[PDB]
Amino acid sequence: TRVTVVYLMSQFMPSKSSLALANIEVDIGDIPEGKTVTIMWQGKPVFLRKR
Amino acid sequence: NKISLYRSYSTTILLSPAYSLGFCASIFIVIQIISGYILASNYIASTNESFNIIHNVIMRELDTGWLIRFNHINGCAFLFIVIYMHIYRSLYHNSITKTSVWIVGIIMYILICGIAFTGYSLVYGQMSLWAIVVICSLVTAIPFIGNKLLILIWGGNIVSSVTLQRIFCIHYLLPLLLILFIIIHLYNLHNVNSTGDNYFINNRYDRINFYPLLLIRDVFIGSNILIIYNIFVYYYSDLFGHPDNYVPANPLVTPSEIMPEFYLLPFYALIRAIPHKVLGIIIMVLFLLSLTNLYPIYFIRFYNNINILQRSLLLLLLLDLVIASKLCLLINHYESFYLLLILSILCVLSHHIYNTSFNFSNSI
Amino acid sequence: NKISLYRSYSTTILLSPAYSLGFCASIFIVIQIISGYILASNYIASTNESFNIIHNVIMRELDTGWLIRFNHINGCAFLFIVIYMHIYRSLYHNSITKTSVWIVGIIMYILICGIAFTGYSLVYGQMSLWAIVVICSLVTAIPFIGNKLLILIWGGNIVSSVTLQRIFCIHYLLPLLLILFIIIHLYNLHNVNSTGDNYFINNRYDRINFYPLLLIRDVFIGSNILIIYNIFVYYYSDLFGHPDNYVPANPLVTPSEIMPEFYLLPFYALIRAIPHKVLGIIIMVLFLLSLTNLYPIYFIRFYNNINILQRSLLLLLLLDLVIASKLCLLINHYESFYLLLILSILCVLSHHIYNTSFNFSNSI
Amino acid sequence: EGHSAYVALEQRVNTRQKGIIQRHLSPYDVDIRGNGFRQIYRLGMQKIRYFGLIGTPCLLVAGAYRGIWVFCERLEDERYWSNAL
Amino acid sequence: SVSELKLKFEEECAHHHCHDIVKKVEVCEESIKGKEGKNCLFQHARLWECVDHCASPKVFALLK
Amino acid sequence: VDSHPPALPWPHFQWFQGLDWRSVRRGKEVYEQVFAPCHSLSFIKYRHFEAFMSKEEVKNMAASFEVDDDPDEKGEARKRPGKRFDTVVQPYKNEQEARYANNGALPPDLSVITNARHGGVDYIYALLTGYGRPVPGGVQLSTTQWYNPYFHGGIIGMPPPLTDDMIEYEDGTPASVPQMAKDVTCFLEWCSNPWWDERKLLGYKTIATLAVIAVSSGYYNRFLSGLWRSRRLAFRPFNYS
Amino acid sequence: FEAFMSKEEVKNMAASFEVDDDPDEKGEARKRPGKRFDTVVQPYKNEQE
Amino acid sequence: MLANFSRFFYKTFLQSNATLIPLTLVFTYXXXXXXXXXXXXXXXXXXXXXXXXXXXXXXXXXXXXXXXXX
Ligand code: HEC
Ligand code: HEM
Ligand code: HEM
Ligand code: HEM
Ligand code: HEM
């Protein structure tokens, strides 16, 4: 019963694909001081600024 | 044996036309079931092509898919109107004494609220998306599991096609459980009979055959109610809706005002009048649980009569609920109305449905 | 009152392990309901996304979506196997005397055949599409209103997305009506009780309490049959299927051999063995209607006992049905098997279930 | 249970019972192995005899069908091997 | 290479376990000469089904 | 009817045994170097290869290709190196294009191929190692048709895809035609059923647990039946002359 | 538009525009004149544009 | 047989649900969930070890390193 409940519930967890786009990493050693760079992440464009 | 059909069940002569509200509610349940089954046979649940197939395929390619959709919307609205009148009548005539009928009714009310919410979600418009977002954010306040549970419910960090598919399946399933609970509702009522205008213990010589007199009365009242209902399906088809739901949902853009359907506003008010999220959730659960009559269980309790004071306070309850809904939606631009919203909510939370004989006793 | 729980229902002591087939069928109905509800929460019905959303989303994006799908498939197959064993036992022990139970069971059997067919239609593969086409070609043979009827069934001249969506709604809806019919089945049985190995009229001193002995026996037999079931789920997942259903549907190409699932093959045989399409339709309808016990109604009929000749003939009926299924599949290439196909079908149609006491009478 | 069709039947048909004595042992005083091998043997023999009886017509008809099946199968093999299709 | 061994095994199996099928397919080859619309696809399919029953597994055991 | 594929002992058709994963690696190599341009794997993504390949190897393999990106700020189309989450590259733009590059034939998608053919893995093996046989009499073969006795009808539009020493395996195993056929069949078995080992393992666990439950419940049923299996009856006699 | 216009006028209006067609023999892309059953022409390729 | 042991065992564990329930939970965990399940898992992993995915990945990294040195 325990494993069956856990398994039926696990059918409702996030899909592996959604777990692949959730985390991304950017290289901050490329942007110089005072420059803002735009990237893509989960559709919403993201600004990285060297404040 | 036609005679045996007439005498199968008998009731009191004091059934005013106000006792057809259950029949009207059943009519609108039937209309909802049929129109929803017709809609679901043309529906695809997915963020890509949900809003499109409602507005471009169902409405504009079928002969009267528009009429089906309008029937469904206004049937939900009128089902809630009739249920509210039904509850108000049952409170007026002290029908809390029909314990089993009342408890099944409250369960059915909760189910129908859930059905309405999950249905409104399926139109992947701006209002649907952001109502889901707000409700699920209220889910996030539970101690020690708000984020795990929220992720499980949504299937991710964001509403998506899997969320739409879950909602579609739940919306399809729940109304059938609702039909079963309606059957149980009527079974209990037949077991304990009806109250009428006044309560009397009548022998068989003072009761009348249910059929066909009350069936014909039900037909008459249902005909009038359907006239009133069709005056809205054909001439005010979006009076109960919000125009922002005719905009395809943008997860990046939030609407100016997020207002639920008019039959959920009271609940929304409870959320807005309680600054603490956990306290708001607790108050919501306690409210829904206190509408029932599950305690005391083994202590001896019985119900006495109802009086003019209680009926006047019932009118006050109605007033407070309506004002609370309106104010809850107004407070987004006008901060001074918080006083009146809180006052109305407080007045609602302290309304006596059952006068407890335990108010009077002595001390050891 | 635990004692009152024990004695609420009593049965005979002659319930051999063969009388747990109803419980096994209940287990598989539960499995199908749960698996189907989980699948539907991830399913989109269309000709552009259906096949893809099963093999690319359900079975590869979830942790054990493949396991859920295999459960659904093999649970359908084993439900049919157990139901056939249930029917065979009912015929062996002359359980047609339980008139209410038998009629409800036949209704449930027809409903389950419909559910299985509509579900198999949802995998928009080659076999699904072409089975739909063949069955509908059977439909269009109705005199007068056939062609129009077909259009209404398909919503067009071909199988399309709307066809898949209505099939999905039907597949979702029907199993719940099946649940209600199972409840009625059990209610009637508890009204008339179980036959057992032999029929006796027992007073309360000769009967035993149902709970918990028969529940424990049901658990034991259910665990054994679940072992057998799971052997197929994990190691023979595709044994009860045709590989051509893993090819996405191609309306321009017909498969070499169109064959239905093993549990519908007998019906298919009844169509291959009757050259005239209208005659085949009529004979299928008469076959289904004749499995029931709805005639005579107001003529006095009662049931006698069953004997060894009848049991041997029942075994012969099983043999003939199996042979007919295999031959109706084999006739596509080899035309000399029509002789044995027709012989087996004629033998099946001439099997006596109820021994007509009217066989013997005198003329005026 | 008192309002059931089988209870009604037993009340209509059977008399008011009298003079019946039943003895039951608690399962804690009964050995599960007590009558195991004897019952296994007896039931196996009974089922062997009974299935030998009621299975004979099916066996005979299956033999006839096997003859027909062999004939048709080899006829069709001969047809295919000679391009007579 | 394993391909040469495969061809050798196929020849051995054809001439030692499907000799009757070989004779039959040779017989049917003569029959279709001149006839219009006739082919030996079925007979050759039977031959190559018989041959691979014995030849194919052996080769399958010689590869990693 | 066509030739029935022989039944061969595959390592994953054995007791307590699963996919080889060495055959799967080598079959991935053969897929990359042979039939990547002709056939497609619509259901396989680069991150799926992180089962027999290392994370960095998968990352480099993904970056080796180009994928469509979101349109430019002016709406212009773009290309972008692939990532883990992107589906492998399609070989053809649309079916017509495919049919034009294969002389009217359309190479099917091989994502579930072993599940889509009768006797799947064997069939595929029997299909690939069956191309050089003599053509039967009375059969007319075009310039783009070949005789394969295992294909439906005996004539196929796929040129013999495998030749000896065509691919240089990384682990040094010689790439003969039967070896490469075995490796691609194992790789396609993995593609069709990427859950083989987990399925077998869950099967063993579930059967064991159900067996425990069955033994215990059978004992308890036998115990409870003891009350009735030993019941005794006695009838008080009448007074008869 | 065949609700306040005539069939011929709607046919000419539809034919006045160019609608994407199914690819040709060699793949690629084709465009064909509009017809009654075609949707009205979009003004932009994609949201960014 | 084992009369004294039977009495002791019954009086200790089986007489009360306050101890029988913990006993059955212990049996569930230590003798079913980490004894049959995990044991079959380990056995499966051990039999099929020369063909393991881990083994394949390790050999692959080794060969890649060896090729990179040329
Ligand atoms: C020259 C391009 C090309 C290459 C390289 C190629 N194929 Fe094919 N393949 C085709 C075409 C074209 C077809 C379609 C055959 C038909 O339908 O007649 C096909 C058909 C198939 C089929 C379908 C057989 C059936 O029964 O329908 C399979 C399986 C297959 N190929 C596997 C492979 C494998 C494995 C490889 C790598 C060894 C491969 N192919 C290499 C072009 C190719
Ligand atoms: C099984 C019966 C039902 C089915 C299959 C069903 C199905 C659907 C479907 C597919 C939709 C989306 C299509 C659309 O939005 O127009 C929908 C919307 C909706 N349903 Fe139902 N429904 C059922 C019963 C009910 C019931 C009983 C209610 C209760 C009032 C209800 C309330 C709603 C609401 C409020 C909406 C959204 C209204 C809107 O479109 O703006 N449905 N339903
Ligand atoms: C689906 C919505 C509902 C339907 C279809 C429904 C239907 C009915 C019907 C047919 C009756 C008997 C006829 C009548 O007296 O009007 C009835 C009576 C009653 N219902 Fe409902 N009902 C619904 C919701 C509710 C709710 C939410 C409650 C609140 C607890 C409720 C409480 C009662 C009571 C107390 C009675 C008996 C009143 C009396 O005779 O004194 N019902 N209902
Ligand atoms: C409400 C309950 C059920 C729901 C919601 C449901 C839903 C679904 C869905 C969405 C599919 C398509 C997904 C897939 O093919 O894997 C499906 C397939 C299927 N269902 Fe159900 N189902 C239900 C009950 C049943 C029952 C009772 C049966 C009969 C035993 C059944 C038999 C099938 C079959 C045979 C298939 C196709 C098998 C295949 O994919 O090859 N379903 N069902
Ligand atoms: C979903 C499929 C079915 C389920 C779940 C089901 C369930 C049950 C159950 C639980 C019982 C009582 C336990 C037993 O005696 O085995 C039963 C008895 C019975 N069923 Fe069904 N049944 C199904 C299909 C059928 C069908 C198709 C028939 C054929 C008309 C049928 C005829 C009977 C009869 C005659 C009995 C009583 C036998 C007797 O005690 O003499 N059932 N069924």
* DSSP output for C289-357: HHTS----SSS--------HHHHHHHHHHHHHHHHHHHHHHHTTT-GGGHHHHHHHHHHHHT--SS--G
Distance, first Cα to last Cα, chain D: 68
Q: Are D22 and C202 in contact (CB under 8 A)?
A: no
Joined tokens for residue C200: 């006796």
Tell me how far the alpha carbon of residue H18 is from its chain's centroid. Answer: 27
Residue of F nearest to D31 (CA): F226
Give the distance between the most distant pair of CA atoms in chain E: 48
Distances (CA, A) of C98 to B70, C91, C139, C191, C199: 48, 11, 34, 10, 12
Note the Cα E51 to chain centre separation in Å: 5
The helix (H) or strand (E) run that includes residue C4 is: helix C2-6
- Among candidates F63, F62, F66, F61, which has minimal Cα distance to F77? F66
Determine which helix (DSSP H) or strand (DSSP E) holds F35, and give its type and residue range.
none
Amino acid at B179: I
Name the residue among D46, D56, D41 with its Cα closest to residue C308.
D56
Q: Do F205 and H60 touch (CB under 8 A)?
A: no
Q: Cα–Cα distance between F156 and F152 in angstroms, integer?
A: 8
What residue type is assigned to position F16 of the chain? Answer: F
The structure tokens listed for H10 are: 């019954």
Q: Which of B191, B356, B327 is nearest to B266 (CA)?
A: B327
Phi, psi (deg, nearest 5) at residue B331: -60, -5
Question: How many helices and strands in chain G, by DSSP H and E?
Answer: 1, 2
- Cβ D51 vs Cβ D44: under 8 Å: no
Give the residues surrounding ligand 1 with Cβ less than 6 Å away: F 34-35, 38-39, 102, 105, 107-108, 113, 117, 124, 127-128, 151, 156-159, 161-162, 184
Q: Whole-angstrom Cα distance, residue B18 to residue C236? A: 62
- F198 and C70 Cβ atoms separated by less than 8 Å: no
**C227 CB neighbour count, 10 Å cutoff:** 17
CA of C101 to the centre of ligand 5 (A): 7
B280 CB-contact burial (10 Å; exposed 0-12 / middle 13-18 / buried 19+): middle
Distance CA B259, CA C168 (A): 33
Residue with tokens 């291959």: C272
Partners of residue D1 in chain C, C-beta under 8 Å: 7-10
- In angstroms, rounded to a whole number, what is the distance separating the alpha carbons of residues B68 and B38? 8
Cα-to-chain-centroid distance, residue G40: 6
Q: Which residues pair with D20 in a beta bridge?
A: F235
Are F96 and G24 contacting, i.e. CB atoms less than 8 angstroms apart? yes
Write down the number of H helices and E strands in chain E. 3, 0
**Chain F contact present for G42, CB below 8 A:** no
Instruction: Report the residue among B90, B110, B199 best suited for mutation to probe ligand 3: largest number of ligand atoms under 8 A from its CB.
Output: B90
Q: Which amino acid is residue F94, in one-letter code?
A: N
| Dihedral pair phi/psi, residue A45, rounded to 5° | -60, 145
Q: State how far the Cα of C212 lies from the Cα of F44, in Å rounded to an integer.
A: 51
Annotated binding residues of B for heme b, written as ranges, equal: 22, 69, 72, 86, 89, 95, 171, 185, 195
Parallel/antiparallel/unpaired status of strands F146-147 and C10-11: unpaired
By C-alpha distance, which of C260, C267, C257 is closest to C324? C267
User: How far is the C-alpha of C342 from the C-alpha of C270, rounded, in Å?
Assistant: 9
- For residues F134 and F191, the answer to whether their CB atoms sit within 8 Å is no
- Smallest-distance ligand from the CA of C80: 4
Computed on alpha carbons and rounded to an integer, the radius of gyration of chain B in Å comes to 23
Q: How many C-beta neighbours within 10 Å does residue D49 have?
A: 9
Q: Which residues of D touch C193 (CB under 8 A)?
A: 4-6
**Helix D5-13 and helix C161-192: axis angle, to 10°?**
30
d(CA F230, CA B288): 56
> What is the rounded end-to-end Cα distance, in angstroms, of chain F?
84
CA–CA distance, C209 with C205 (Å, rounded to integer): 11
Burial degree of G39 (CB within 10 A; 0-12, 13-18, 19+): exposed
Q: How far apart are CA H50 and CA H59, in angstroms?
A: 11
Using alpha carbons, select from F199, F170, F201, F183 the residue that is nearest to residue F11: F183
D77 touches chain E (CB under 8 A): no
G25 and F100 within 8 Å at the Cβ level: the answer is: yes
Read off the tokens for B43.
């529906």
CA separation for the pair B141, B281 (Å, rounded): 8
Q: How far is B47 from chain A (nearest CA, A)?
A: 14
Q: Is F180 exposed, middle or buried (0-12, 13-18, 19+ CB in 10 A)?
A: buried
Residues of chain A numbered 1-51 and touching chain B (CB < 8 Å): 9, 12-15, 18, 22, 42, 44
Calculated CA dihedral for residues F212, F214, F220, F221, nearest 10 degrees: -170
- Closest chain A residue to the Cα of B251, Cα to Cα: A44
Token digits of residue B279: 């306290």
φ, ψ for residue D22 (rounded to 5)?
A: -120, 140
Rounded Cα distance between B244 and B258, Å, is 9
Considering only CB atoms, D81 lies closest to which of E24, E32, E35, namely: E24
Q: Do chains E and D touch (3 or more CB pairs under 8 A)?
A: yes
Helices (H), chain F: 22-30, 55-63, 95-101, 113-116, 120-128, 177-192, 196-229
CA D48 to chain centre: 10
Half-sphere exposure of C307 (CA within 13 A, CB side): 4
Contacts of E45 (CB under 8 A, 6+ apart): F1, F2, F3, F149, F154
What is the spatial distance between Cα C345 and Cα C319, in angstroms, rounded to a whole number? 11
What are the φ and ψ backbone dihedral angles of G37, each rounded to 5 degrees?
A: -80, 0
Q: Return the residue matching tokens 């209208």.
A: C278
Q: Is F212 in Cβ contact with H36 (below 8 Å)?
A: yes
User: Which residue reads 């190599």 in tokens?
Assistant: F29
Contact between G26 and F94 using a beta-carbon 8 Å cutoff: no
Q: Which of C152, C96, C140 is nearest to C292 (CA)?
A: C96
| Documented resolution in Å | 3.1
C188 contacts C68 by C-beta, under 8 angstroms: no
Q: Which residues contact F127 (CB under 8 A, 6 or more apart)?
A: F148, F150, F151
Would an 8 Å CB–CB cutoff place D80 in contact with chain E? yes
Q: Which of C198, C321, C216, C225 is nearest to C264 (CA)?
A: C321
The pick from C30, C72, C128 for probing ligand 4's pocket by mutation, whose C-beta has the most ligand atoms within 8 angstroms, reads C72
F157 alpha-carbon distance from chain centroid: 22
- Angle subtended by helix axes B21-40 and B161-192, to nearest 10: 150
Q: Which two tokens stand for residue E49?
A: 């089904």
The 8-class DSSP code of residue A47 comes to: E
DSSP per-residue letters across B122-191:
HS-BHHHHHHHHHHHHHHTTSSS-SHHHHHHHHTSSS--HHHHHHHHHHHHHHHHHHHHHHHHHHHHHHH
Q: How far apart are CA C29 and CA C176, in angstroms?
A: 10
From C81, C98, C90, C141, select the one nearest C263 (Cα to Cα): C81
> Could you give the CA distance from residue F83 to residue D24 in angstroms, rounded to a whole number?
75
Angle at C101 between CA C99 and CA C103, to 5 degrees: 65
What's the CA gap between C222 and C229, in Å, rounded?
10
Quickly tell me which residue has 């052996």 as its tokens.
E58
Experimental method: cryo-EM
Question: Residue H24 in 3-state DSSP?
Answer: helix
User: Rounded to an integer, what is the distance from CA A21 to the centroid of its chain?
Assistant: 5
Across the interface, of F43, F112, F228, the residue whose CB is closest to C13 is: F228
Atom of ligand 5 nearest to the CA of C93: 41
CB of B94 closer than 8 Å to CB of B303: yes
| 8 Å CB contact of C193 and D14 | no
CA distance C141 to C182: 34
Amino acid at F235: F
Cβ atoms F45, F62 nearer than 8 A: no
- Tell me the C-alpha distance between C119 and C170, whole Å: 9
Element (H, E) at G48: none
Type of residue numbered E12: E
Going by C-alpha positions, the residue among F19, F14, F15, F20 that lies closest to residue F197 is F19
Query: Are F21 and H53 spatial neighbours (Cβ–Cβ below 8 Å)?
Result: yes
Write out the two tokens for H2: 């084992």
Output the six-digit token pair for C295: 């005639």
First vs last C-alpha separation in chain H: 76
Residue F63's identity, in one-letter code, is A
Three-state SS at E7: helix
Rounded-to-integer distance, Cα B42 and Cα B78, Å = 24
Q: How far apart are CA B155 and CA A13, in angstroms?
A: 5
- Euclidean distance between CA atoms C333 and D72, whole angstroms: 12
- Rg of chain A taking only CA atoms, in angstroms: 19
3-class DSSP state for residue G32? strand
Q: State the distance from the centre of ligand 5 to the C-alpha of D7, rounded, in angstroms.
A: 21
DSSP-derived letter for residue B248 is B
Alpha-carbon distances, residue E34 vs E16, E37, E38, E45 (angstroms): 31, 9, 9, 22
d(CA B94, CA B97): 7
Tokens of B46: 């997915």
Contact C323, C344 (CB under 8 A): yes
φ/ψ (deg, to 5) at B287: -60, -50
> One-letter amino acid identity for D69?
W
Tokens of C334: 């080899």
**Distance between alpha carbon C92 and the CA centroid of its chain, in Å?**
18
| Kind of pairing between the strands at B208-209 and F155-156 | unpaired
Burial class (CB in 10 A: 0-12, 13-18, 19+), C303: middle
Verify cis geometry, omega within 30 degrees of 0, for the bond prior to F178. no
Torsion, Cα of F173, F175, F177, F183 (10° steps): 60
| Distance between CA atoms of residues F232 and G2, nearest Å | 91
Residue of chain F nearest G46, judged by CA positions: F75
Contact predicate C192/C101, CB 8 Å: yes
Per the structure block, which two tokens stand in for C145? 């209103």
Name which of F44, F33, F204, F210 is nearest C61 in CA terms: F44
What does the DSSP assignment read for C16-47? -GGGGHHHHHHHHHHHHHHHHHHHHTT---ST
Structure tokens at F144: 């783009």
CB contact under 8 A, F96 and G44: no
Tokens of E23: 């004779």
Report the C-alpha gap between G8 and E44 in whole angstroms.
Answer: 63
Q: Tell me if residue B11 falls in helix, strand or coil.
A: strand
Ligand closest in space to the Cα of C180: 5
How many CB atoms are located within 10 Å of the residue F99 CB? Answer: 17
Residue with tokens 């019985």: B302
